[PDB]
């Protein structure tokens, strides 16, 4: 019922391989709509979903300006943080930056997000209130000082609780016939002998959306994790998602096991048995 908009930035230094690469993606929920790459030919903020193409060239200008600028400042933060932790000119390092907002079915603002990582670790982040910065390490407090007195958190709260939610609602209302759809998972089972006395019962949930889903095995009515394998949710490459869960069971006892599927696009949770 709820919805979310999230932007992800990544910048990687490649000393000797060239000048730092910058990649930026924007998702509404589990649906990407925009992308940008520094190694890209067009070097333009491109569309990735049909329902966002309906924006005047000023959109595609403003966003492009912003992403280019952010790429440059990221280029700065690279050498900056390379100075902080005293890192060689040689080493390759990564800056990741995630931010965005959440809304209910009501469209009401629910929560804001801004986190910043260096080399894959939390470097700094913004709390719920969108007022106070939290720094993970020593050198991060320096940055926090630079942003505490620059009223940066104010700019962030002004953007997130305002413009972000606005454009989120707009995107939702626009793409409604794709963004507010709920593809129910087509489910089925497979069954393969493993030993002379055992078999695998694999429970399949395909072609669903959104990715959020729950698959569980039950022995005679009580859950099992013993002898079970659960794979991470994966994209089909069409906008839908796939997932499965398998359990190794004794031969002839497949009737005792029950697979359970839960997903928003389902009125009532399914129960599959072999």
């Amino acid at each position: 019922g709820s919805h979310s908009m999230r932007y992800f930035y990544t910048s990687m230094s490649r000393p000797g391989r060239g000048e730092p690469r910058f990649i930026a993606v924007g998702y509404v929920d589990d649906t990407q709509f925009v992308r940008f790459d520094s190694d890209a030919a067009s070097q333009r903020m491109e569309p990735r979903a049909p329902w966002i193409e309906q924006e005047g060239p000023e959109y595609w200008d403003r966003n492009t300006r912003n992403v280019k600028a952010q790429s440059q400042t990221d280029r700065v933060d690279l050498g900056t943080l390379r100075g902080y932790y005293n890192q060689s000119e040689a080493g390759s390092h990564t800056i990741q930056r995630m931010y965005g907002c959440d809304v209910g079915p009501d469209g009401r603002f629910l929560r804001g997000y801004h986190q910043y990582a260096y080399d894959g670790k939390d470097y700094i982040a913004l709390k719920e209130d969108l007022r106070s910065w939290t720094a993970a390490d020593m050198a991060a407090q320096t940055t926090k000082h630079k942003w505490e007195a620059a009223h940066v958190a104010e700019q962030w709260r002004a953007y997130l609780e305002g413009t972000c939610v606005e454009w989120l609602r707009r995107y939702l209302e626009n793409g409604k016939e794709t963004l507010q759809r709920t593809d129910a998972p087509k489910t089925h089972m497979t069954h393969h002998a493993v030993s002379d006395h055992e078999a695998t019962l694999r429970c399949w949930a395909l072609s669903f959306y959104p990715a959020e889903i729950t698959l569980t095995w039950q022995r005679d009515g009580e859950d099992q994790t013993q002898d079970t394998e659960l794979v991470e949710t994966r994209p089909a490459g069409d906008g839908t998602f796939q997932k499965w869960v398998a359990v190794v069971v004794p031969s002839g006892q497949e009737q005792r096991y029950t697979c359970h599927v839960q997903h928003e696009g389902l009125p009532k949770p399914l129960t599959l048995k072999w």
Partner: peptide, 9 residues
């Protein structure tokens, strides 16, 4: 859209 916030660390 995106943000205009640009500030070094």
């Amino acid at each position: 859209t995106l943000t205009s916030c640009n500030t070094s660390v």
